[model samples]
Target: PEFLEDPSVLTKDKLKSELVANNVTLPAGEQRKDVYVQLYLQHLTARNRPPLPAGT
Candidate 1:
């Protein structure tokens, strides 16, 4: 992944700010890193999925 390959492009500080902008937060005492972004992306992707129709 380009993100993993160039982690410097998403420095810890930048990740923190981006997380703030997106209303995402990490556990207390935790730090911003690839895993944080990964988890947030997972949440975002999950949130944007289409809803299921009525019961089968």
Candidate 2:
């Protein structure tokens, strides 16, 4: 992934920065960078999902 291209950009600090920049929040007590990435990806996927029909 293009996001992973910069080796220096994959640290936990960088992950926190990215999450803040993206307005993505992780659950309390979770401090794993990989989890942050997964949350970010989930946010991205949810954002790209099409809206539901007028009548469900």
Candidate 3:
């Protein structure tokens, strides 16, 4: 899970930094793109939550 936690740990920051990296940039008054990014991450987490314990 640790490895999965930062699925984009390497490229996330890279995309975050470069304006050209992302298609659109959130203005100061708006929410950060990272928020939506995290949302996707969360969705993925929920979709792939840990398996049920053995011998239920």
Candidate number with greatest lDDT: 2
Q: Residue by residue across 1-56, what tens digits does model 1's lDDT show?
A: 11232234665555545555556666533553466556545544334333457664
Candidate 2, pairs of clashing residues: none
TM-score of 2: 0.40
TM-score of each: 0.37, 0.40, 0.25
Which of the numbered candidates is closest to the native, going by highest TM-score? 2
lDDT of each model, Cα atoms only? 0.48, 0.51, 0.43
Worst 10 residues of 3 by lDDT: 15-24
lDDT of 2 at 15: 53
Model 3: runs farther than 4 Å from truth? Answer: 1-31
Report the candidate with higher TM-score, 1 versus 3.
Answer: 1
The alpha-carbon deviation from the true structure for residue 49 of candidate 3, after best TM-score superposition, in angstroms, is 1.9
Model 1 stretches astray by more than 4 angstroms: 1-8, 28-33, 44-56
Q: Report the Cα lDDT for residue 38, model 3.
A: 63
Ranking by lDDT: 2, 1, 3
Q: How many residue pairs clash in each candidate?
A: 0, 0, 0
RMSD (Cα, Å) for all candidates, in order, is 9.1, 9.2, 7.6
lDDT score of model 2?
A: 0.51
